[PDB]
């Protein structure tokens, strides 16, 4: 059971400044390669911040 | 008594001039029982062309045993799974590890060359840069040449995950400022599954 994988998915689901398109891309990324979930979440969090109102 | 499975080098799976291979490395084999048996499978089916190397006694007198399986470029690229089953006296039950190419929609690298900064031109040696971005999966190879002759004094960063879920890297070729200033032509070539012919090459020179 992969906690980091499940956790990246959850936090990405709830990030408020991502488009639906971006949200979807990151969740597809997580499916394609779970072993880089840490880095996918960091990229997501970093894009979500740069897209602050 | 433990097992590791390694993929082929990216350049090997991509160039027909090369021979790619999957490698099974067993460590901490007891000196009491150095016998190790390797069974290999490709998508469930057993193959027999694997080769075990001469074992290597470690400082603490344990052994390290390597099995190397040549594979078909096209089988790796199309996602076949390679399974290694490892057998030894010391093992409760045999050990299995499997490996296969990273899944996900492939994306073609964009390749840009960048000349030295002006501030860098005070030094004896300068820095030629190649940016490679937008590519997926991360499996990639990079070299430099100058009018067809290989360069060696370059360093290429590991791929890094970018903000759109593709990868990027930089490759830096160090050259004598003299060669740069007298207009010699440098070229970076990039090898990846999503490029036509699995390669492209981009040139850099003083204008």
From Swiss-Prot, chain A:
Cell compartment(s), UniProt: Secreted, Cell wall
Use in biotechnology or industry: Important immunodiagnostic reagent because of its ability to bind the Fab and Fc fragments of a wide range of mammalian immunoglobulins.
Residue ranges of Immunoglobulin-binding region C repeats: 1-53
Assembly behavior: Interacts with host TNFRSF1A; this interaction leads to the stimulation of both surface expression and shedding of TNFRSF1A.
Entry's free-text remark on domains: Each of the immunoglobulin-binding region repeats can bind the Fc region of an immunoglobulin.
Function statement: Plays a role in the inhibition of the host innate and adaptive immune responses. Possesses five immunoglobulin-binding domains that capture both the fragment crystallizable region (Fc region) and the Fab region (part of Ig that identifies antigen) of immunoglobulins. In turn, Staphylococcus aureus is protected from phagocytic killing via inhibition of Ig Fc region. In addition, the host elicited B-cell response is prevented due to a decrease of antibody-secreting cell proliferation that enter the bone marrow, thereby decreasing long-term antibody production.
Family, per entry: Belongs to the immunoglobulin-binding protein SpA family.
Protein's name according to its UniProt entry: Immunoglobulin G-binding protein A
The organism of origin for this protein: Staphylococcus aureus
Whole-protein residues included: 274 to 326 of 508
Swiss-Prot record, chain B:
PTM characteristics: N-linked glycans at Asn-155 are noncore fucosylated and the vast majority are diantennary species with a bisecting GlcNAc. Among them the most dominant glycans are HexNAc5Hex4, HexNAc5Hex5, and HexNAc5Hex5Sia1.
Domain Ig-like: 1-100, 109-205
GO molecular function: antigen binding; immunoglobulin receptor binding
Keyword entries, A-Z: Adaptive immunity, Cell membrane, Disulfide bond, Glycoprotein, Immunity, Immunoglobulin, Immunoglobulin domain, Membrane, Repeat, Secreted, Transmembrane, Transmembrane helix
GO cellular component: blood microparticle; extracellular exosome; extracellular region; extracellular space; IgG immunoglobulin complex; immunoglobulin complex, circulating; plasma membrane
GO process terms (BP): adaptive immune response; antibacterial humoral response; B cell receptor signaling pathway; complement activation, classical pathway
Disulfide bridge partners, by residue number: 24-84, 130-188
Positions annotated as glycosylated: 60, 155
Region (CH3): 104-207
UniProt region (CH2), positions on chain: 1-103
Primary role: Constant region of immunoglobulin heavy chains. Immunoglobulins, also known as antibodies, are membrane-bound or secreted glycoproteins produced by B lymphocytes. In the recognition phase of humoral immunity, the membrane-bound immunoglobulins serve as receptors which, upon binding of a specific antigen, trigger the clonal expansion and differentiation of B lymphocytes into immunoglobulins-secreting plasma cells. Secreted immunoglobulins mediate the effector phase of humoral immunity, which results in the elimination of bound antigens.
Quaternary structure annotation from Swiss-Prot or TrEMBL: Immunoglobulins are composed of two identical heavy chains and two identical light chains; disulfide-linked.
Name of this chain's protein: Immunoglobulin heavy constant gamma 3
Naturally occurring in which organism (per UniProt): Homo sapiens
Lineage start: Eukaryota, Metazoa, Chordata, Craniata, Vertebrata
Gene for this chain: IGHG3
Residues of the full protein shown: 168 to 374 of 446
């Amino acid at each position: 059971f992969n906690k980091e994988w499940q956790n990246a998915f959850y936090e990405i689901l709830h990030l408020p400044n991502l488009t639906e398109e971006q949200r979807n891309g990151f969740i597809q990324s997580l499916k394609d390669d779970p072993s880089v979930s840490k880095e996918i979440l960091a990229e997501a969090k970093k894009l979500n911040d740069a897209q602050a109102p | 008594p433990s097992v590791f499975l390694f993929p082929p080098k990216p350049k090997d799976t991509l160039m027909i001039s090369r021979t790619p291979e999957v490698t099974c490395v067993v460590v901490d084999v007891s000196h009491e029982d150095p016998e190790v048996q390797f069974k290999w499978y490709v998508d469930g089916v057993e193959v027999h062309n694997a080769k075990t190397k001469p074992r290597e006694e470690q400082f603490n007198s344990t052994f390290r045993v390597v099995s190397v399986l040549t594979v078909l470029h096209q089988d790796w690229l199309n996602g076949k799974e390679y399974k290694c089953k490892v057998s030894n006296k010391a093992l409760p039950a045999p050990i299995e590890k499997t490996i296969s190419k990273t899944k996900g929609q492939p994306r073609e690298p964009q390749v840009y060359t960048l000349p030295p900064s002006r501030e860098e031109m005070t030094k004896n040696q300068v820095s030629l840069t190649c940016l490679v971005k937008g590519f997926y999966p991360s499996d990639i190879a990079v070299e430099w040449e100058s009018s067809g002759q290989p360069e060696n004094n370059y360093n290429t960063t590991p791929p890094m995950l970018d903000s759109d879920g593709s990868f990027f890297l930089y490759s830096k070729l160090t050259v004598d400022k003299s060669r740069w200033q007298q207009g010699n032509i440098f070229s970076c070539s990039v090898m990846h599954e999503a490029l036509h012919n699995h390669y492209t090459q981009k040139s850099l020179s003083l204008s």
